[PDB]
Structure formats: C-alpha cells, structure tokens
C-alpha cells in the first residue's frame, strides 16, 4: 500500500484546479518568481528576435494541498502533473512567435505545509 496513493487521494479527491487558492474572493495569491537562464541561443537581427533557454521557477502556497509528513509515513514531497493543480498561468508577454507558455509541462512538487513549486523549462523567442 503506497502512501503516495493515499496522500494523492486525500489531497485531490475534492479539489478544483479552476479556483484560486484563496479563502476569500478578495485575497491575493503571492507568487515567488525566479528565472534561470541556461543559455542565450541567439539574437537574429534580421528578424529582431532573441532566442533563450530558461527555467521558470514559481513557488506559492495552496492551503487546500496542505498535509503533514507524520500522517503519511514521512512523505515530504509529492510529484503530481501540473494539470491537476491550479496555476497562475505565467506567460511571456513580449514573445514574437505566438508561443506564450512553457516548452515542457513538468510535474509540480507539493511539499508539506501546502507549498507548491513548479520549475518547467522553456525556449522563448522574444522581441528585441
């Protein structure tokens, strides 16, 4: 009996990824943002386009996904697909090719205390 299955059912049996993780409608979700540049692919001057490879790290709190390790055999991290959780939907606004989102939809990491982290990679072609 894998404890990850029990934790996943506990957290996601009654969970709406369409609703923001706020107790009241007027509260705000705070997103801690990091952008790690791994490589500047190029700057095409004829097309005026900067091609870069980055990782977009975003951390936030989801009170609905709150759990303690002691109740689940000491699990401190659960990987789940990013489509099952609410996301702030971060996009690059100044993209030139119409690609707003990330390149690979990686799993989110859910840490005890309700802390969600998402660190997908992305290739961005931006206006410069």
């Amino acid at each position: 009996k894998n404890e990850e299955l029990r934790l996943y059912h506990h957290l996601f049996n009654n969970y709406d990824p369409g609703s923001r993780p706020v107790r009241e409608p007027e509260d705000t979700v705070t997103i801690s943002l990091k952008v790690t540049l791994t490589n500047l692919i190029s700057l095409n001057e004829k097309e005026e386009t900067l091609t870069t490879s980055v990782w977009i790290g975003i951390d936030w709190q989801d009170y609905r996904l709150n759990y303690s390790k002691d109740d689940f055999g000491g699990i401190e991290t659960l990987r789940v697909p990013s489509e099952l959780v609410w996301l702030p939907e971060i996009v690059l606004e100044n993209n030139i090719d119409g690609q707003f989102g990330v390149a690979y939809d990686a799993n989110v990491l859910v840490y005890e205390g309700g802390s969600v982290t998402w660190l997908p990679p992305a290739i961005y072609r931006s206006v410069c």
């Binding site: 791994t38 490589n39 692919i41 091609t51 490879s53 991290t77 990987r79 390149a103 690979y104 990686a106 799993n107 990491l109 660190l119 990679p121 290739i123």
Partner: protein, 102 residues
C-alpha cells in the same frame, strides 16, 4: 500514455523538444518489467571550437535526466558504458572517433 513513466529531459536542448513527444507503445512482461523505446530528434547545444576548421574535432554532449524526480525517489543507471551504435547510419561529413556515457 496510460502508465507512469520517468520524465527524462535533455538539459542542453537548444531549439528542439525537451522531453519525449513521440509516445510509442511499451512492452510489458508478466513480471512487471517495462521496456519503452521512444524515438526522438535531439537538437542539442554544442560548443563548436573552430580553431582547426576544416580539420576540426568536436565533442558534442547530450545531458539527460529526470526533471522533477531526484535520485532518492528515481535512480537512472546507464545500460552500457557506451552509446549503442549498432544501427548507426554512416555520415558523409563526420567520423565518430569516440563515444561514452557518464
């Protein structure tokens, strides 16, 4: 697509796909052993030293790893010390002097 898979990603992807996008079938034995052999086009980034061009030697790498799983939950081990070149098509422009996986 129906089963859990490891999320291997090419770290040094330049302008291609980071992960596997061609989801071919897995072979499953009654013991639970899974073999999955997807194809891919890797457009990786290599530092090209042009000093001796056109008599130049290059060292192109391909870093591969599970993106969201650390070594304490998912461990990857090489199948062999070297890449499999048994079905490699001969190149009219390059000769692979050496190959190795660390």
């Amino acid at each position: 697509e129906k089963i859990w898979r490891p999320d291997l990603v090419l770290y040094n992807n330049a302008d291609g796909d980071f992960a596997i996008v061609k989801f071919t079938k897995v072979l499953l034995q009654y013991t639970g052993h899974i073999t999955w052999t997807p194809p891919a086009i890797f457009k990786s980034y290599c530092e090209i030293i042009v000093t001796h061009f056109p008599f130049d030697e290059q060292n192109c790498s391909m870093k591969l790893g599970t993106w969201t799983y650390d070594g304490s939950v998912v461990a990857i081990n090489p199948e062999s010390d070297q890449p499999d070149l048994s079905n490699f098509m001969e190149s009219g422009e390059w000769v692979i002097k050496e190959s190795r996986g660390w």
